[PDB]
Amino acid sequence: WVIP
Amino acid sequence: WVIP
Amino acid sequence: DSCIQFTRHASDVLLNLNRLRSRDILTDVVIVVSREQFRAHKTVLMACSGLFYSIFTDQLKCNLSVINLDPEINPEGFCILLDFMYTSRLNLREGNIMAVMATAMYLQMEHVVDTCRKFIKASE
Amino acid sequence: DSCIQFTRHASDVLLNLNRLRSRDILTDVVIVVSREQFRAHKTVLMACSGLFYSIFTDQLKCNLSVINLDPEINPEGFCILLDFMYTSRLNLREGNIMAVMATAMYLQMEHVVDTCRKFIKASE
Numbered sequence: 001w002v003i004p
Numbered sequence: 005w006v007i008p
Numbered sequence: 009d010s011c012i013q014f015t016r017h018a019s020d021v022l023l024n025l026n027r028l029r030s031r032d033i034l035t036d037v038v039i040v041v042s043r044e045q046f047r048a049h050k051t052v053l054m055a056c057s058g059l060f061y062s063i064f065t066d067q068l069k070c071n072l073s074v075i076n077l078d079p080e081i082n083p084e085g086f087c088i089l090l091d092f093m094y095t096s097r098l099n100l101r102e103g104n105i106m107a108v109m110a111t112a113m114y115l116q117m118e119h120v121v122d123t124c125r126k127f128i129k130a131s132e
Numbered sequence: 133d134s135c136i137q138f139t140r141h142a143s144d145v146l147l148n149l150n151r152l153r154s155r156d157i158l159t160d161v162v163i164v165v166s167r168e169q170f171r172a173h174k175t176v177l178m179a180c181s182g183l184f185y186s187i188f189t190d191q192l193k194c195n196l197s198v199i200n201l202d203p204e205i206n207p208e209g210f211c212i213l214l215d216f217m218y219t220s221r222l223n224l225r226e227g228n229i230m231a232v233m234a235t236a237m238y239l240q241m242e243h244v245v246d247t248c249r250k251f252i253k254a255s256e
């Protein structure tokens with residue numbers, strides 16, 4: 001999971 | 005396009 | 009093999025599947041969550057959810073145009089997860105995390121359950 | 133928005149769509165290319181091809197279960213492109229590049245046409  |  | 013790969017292909021396919029969903033093009037099922045209805049493509053639902061994969065590989069249920077979810081399922085939680093299925097983006101907030109996690113557990117979406125557990129553990 | 137994103141989601145969706153195709157699950161059209169037949173999902177074809185997007189948004193053609201391609205279309209070229217649609221992997225070889233490019237032009241798959249043009253220019 002990432003900060004897009 | 006890339007070499008996968 | 010000796011194939012070449014187009015990096016953005018999977019993302020572009022998903023963007024187009026979401027555009028089709030928004031325009032109600034070739035949607036083949038309506039998911040009913042208490043008073044709310046959500047139109048979708050069976051193949052996308054199966055590709056994202058262990059529960060939908062089970063339902064639509066069933067010899068009788070594969071032909072249904074309406075699927076009614078358990079009455080304990082929160083419509084907003086379902087909406088957030090349906091958006092995630094079609095975009096890879098999860099709108100996870102303090103106000104919805106419990107509903108999102110419970111819905112992801114029911115839908116059998118392990119990666120969502122995992123990030124919800126981690127975000128909850130960080131706040132305790 | 134304040135969304136989080138699951139990097140591998142789009143790739144995992146496409147992998148599952150390909151698994152469904154291989155098992156002939158919820159495939160809703162057969163593409164006929166001279167003596168050869170290819171089963172697929174209309175939504176995936178539309179999401180990858182300008183030609184299929186046009187065909188399946190047509191009020192009459194959207195309901196067809198069989199689509200016959202132009203007799204000049206090479207089945208191997210079509211097969212390579214259908215595999216690309218479901219995997220992001222293009223099996224481009226000296227022996228098939230001309231057929232792949234002609235098929236990609238007909239199917240309106242601009243990124244494939246682009247890499248074929250570049251590979252051809254490098255060999256001249």
Ligand SMILES: N#Cc1c(Cl)ncnc1Nc1ccc2c(c1)CC(=O)N2
Nearest residue numbers: 054055056057058116117118148151
């Ligand atoms: N459609 C399809 C499908 C196929 Cl073909 N093979 C394998 N899994 C498929 N889908 C599916 C099954 C289980 C789970 C998910 C997706 C996400 C998750 O957390 N659990």
Ligand SMILES: N#Cc1c(Cl)ncnc1Nc1ccc2c(c1)CC(=O)N2
Nearest residue numbers: 024027178179180181182240241242
């Ligand atoms: N399905 C869908 C779709 C939608 Cl909804 N919106 C926009 N394009 C869509 N698909 C589509 C149209 C044109 C082309 C491609 C795909 C690849 C390419 O080279 N040209």
Ligand SMILES: [Cl-]
Nearest residue numbers: 071072073074
């Ligand atoms: Cl029904």
Ligand SMILES: [Cl-]
Nearest residue numbers: 117118119120
């Ligand atoms: Cl997931």
Ligand SMILES: [Cl-]
Nearest residue numbers: 195196197198
């Ligand atoms: Cl027909």
Ligand SMILES: [Cl-]
Nearest residue numbers: 241242243244
């Ligand atoms: Cl393309």
